[PDB]
Amino acid sequence: GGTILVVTGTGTGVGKTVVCAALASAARQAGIDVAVCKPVQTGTARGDDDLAEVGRLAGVTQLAGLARYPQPMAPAAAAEHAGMALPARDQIVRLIADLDRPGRLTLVEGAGGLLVELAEPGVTLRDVAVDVAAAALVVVTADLGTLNHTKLTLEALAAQQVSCAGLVIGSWPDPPGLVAASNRSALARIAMVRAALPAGAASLDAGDFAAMSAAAFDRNWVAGLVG
Amino acid sequence: GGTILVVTGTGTGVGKTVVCAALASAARQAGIDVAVCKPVQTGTARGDDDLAEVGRLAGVTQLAGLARYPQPMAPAAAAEHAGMALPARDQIVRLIADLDRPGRLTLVEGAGGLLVELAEPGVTLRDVAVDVAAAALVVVTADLGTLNHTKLTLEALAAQQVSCAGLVIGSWPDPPGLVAASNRSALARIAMVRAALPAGAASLDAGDFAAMSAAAFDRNWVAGLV
Ligand SMILES: O=C(O)C[C@@H]1CCC[C@H]1C(=O)c1ccc(C(=O)O)cc1
Ligand SMILES: O=C(O)C[C@@H]1CCC[C@H]1C(=O)c1ccc(C(=O)O)cc1
């Protein structure tokens, strides 16, 4: 196949979707075929659609979804609230493998953080990553609290020998405060910081977003993700 | 010795200090001697003093600390900015062991979440819980995001055979709301929920707060800590 990357985060609202779109665009500009896949999407009763936003910002046409639940809640709660069940483990894995092909970067965006349940019983994105031999790109914040959350996530990735492809800061303030700078430097000491997306990256239009995306990431690391 | 309990949290600002004070107050109301050790304290420029809060809210007098930094940052960054190393692993472990005595509940409060650096070099509250054979109480929020953070923190505990004394929600909202109430059930499925401190409990005066604390925890669980 090609290269599968799960895109998780330290928590919710940390920028997984905008990092997905931003990495997708940077890879597309390097001539890499990109698919983005969102096995579990909650919050549809308020218009959340990460697949839609990713296409909107990065022009990905190859967008695969699976489970959709209305309430803006954890996959497990939003399912119970809807009278619905979670997908099964081998259904998510099937969705990804069916996208996987050589020369393609397939991004699997999670729901919330790494240990959120996506399938019964206690199946997480980390388990999926094992099942499909994917590295995890961890979306982190610059805010106070990020250092503990990142260290936890990395440990949880290592506990199952899921390789960390590095961190992305979902929102980088212009200009940075004392904490923001301190965190960025400390983050860089615990893992590679693949990029620091500028604050407001998601309000950009197509071309602004594609330029931001091309600048955000090291061209040579992006190009190196897919042979 | 006695019973040592580290009080940690999923993160920062989740209610670690108020929960120490609350469990200290409930344990005091059960006739338990309570000491609270806060090795490293930051944000002192703006008035942060977690041991003072425990004193005022819970009446604890055995309040033990080693270092104070003015910058409202994680200990390693406040110390970086201040130009002075964190205390030594040895100082923290020995302070806590000296605090520990039979019949006393010794609470140990970190900074931020479980895996924050507190001592030289890269020593965490997890490492300290190991060294003094302490179990961890994990403070958590009711808010969207808490489930992943709690599951992450409990894993990090298990990975070093540090026992989990349970969860406390540091601020229970009024009224709950759908996500808070769904999280409370989910958390309870993950570990024992020992208490949910009502929002605003930190602004209580001593008598009010004591009454809250007496009522927040199970009388028998608390009494059975020593
Ligand atoms: O948690 C507290 O006790 C409040 C304190 C006050 C000053 C900054 C807070 C702190 O220590 C801290 C620890 C770790 C992290 C992090 O993981 O990035 C962030 C902040
Ligand atoms: O994808 C997101 O993170 C944004 C979505 C929007 C609404 C619910 C968010 C969600 O999925 C989620 C997942 C897990 C947890 C938790 O561990 O507590 C909280 C929220």
From Swiss-Prot, chain A:
Inhibited by ADP. It catalyses: (7R,8S)-7,8-diammoniononanoate + CO2 + ATP = (4R,5S)-dethiobiotin + ADP + phosphate + 3 H(+). GO terms for molecular function: ATP binding; dethiobiotin synthase activity; magnesium ion binding. It is an enzyme of class 6 (ligase). InterPro entries: DTB_synth_BioD (IPR004472), P-loop_NTPase (IPR027417). Changing G170N: Decreases affinity for NaHCO(3) 3-fold, for CTP 1.8-fold and for GTP 3.8-fold. Its EC number is 6.3.3.3. Keywords: ATP-binding, Biotin biosynthesis, Cytoplasm, Ligase, Magnesium, Metal-binding, Nucleotide-binding. Its main location: cytoplasm. Substrate binds at K38, P39, V40, Q41, T42, G145, T146, L147, N148. Its cofactor is Mg(2+). The active site is at K38. Pathway: Cofactor biosynthesis; biotin biosynthesis; biotin from 7,8-diaminononanoate: step 1/2. SUPFAM superfamilies: P-loop containing nucleoside triphosphate hydrolases. It comes from the Bacteria. Binds 1 Mg(2+) per subunit. Homodimer. Belongs to the dethiobiotin synthetase family. Catalyzes a mechanistically unusual reaction, the ATP-dependent insertion of CO2 between the N7 and N8 nitrogen atoms of 7,8-diaminopelargonic acid (DAPA, also called 7,8-diammoniononanoate) to form a ureido ring. Can use a range of NTPs; has highest affinity for CTP (KD is measured as 17.2 uM or 0.160 uM in 2 different papers) while KD for ATP is 331 uM or 75 uM in the same papers. Gly-170 plays a role in NTP discrimination. This is Dethiobiotin synthetase BioD. The lineage of its organism: Bacteria, Bacillati, Actinomycetota, Actinomycetes, Mycobacteriales. The gene is bioD.
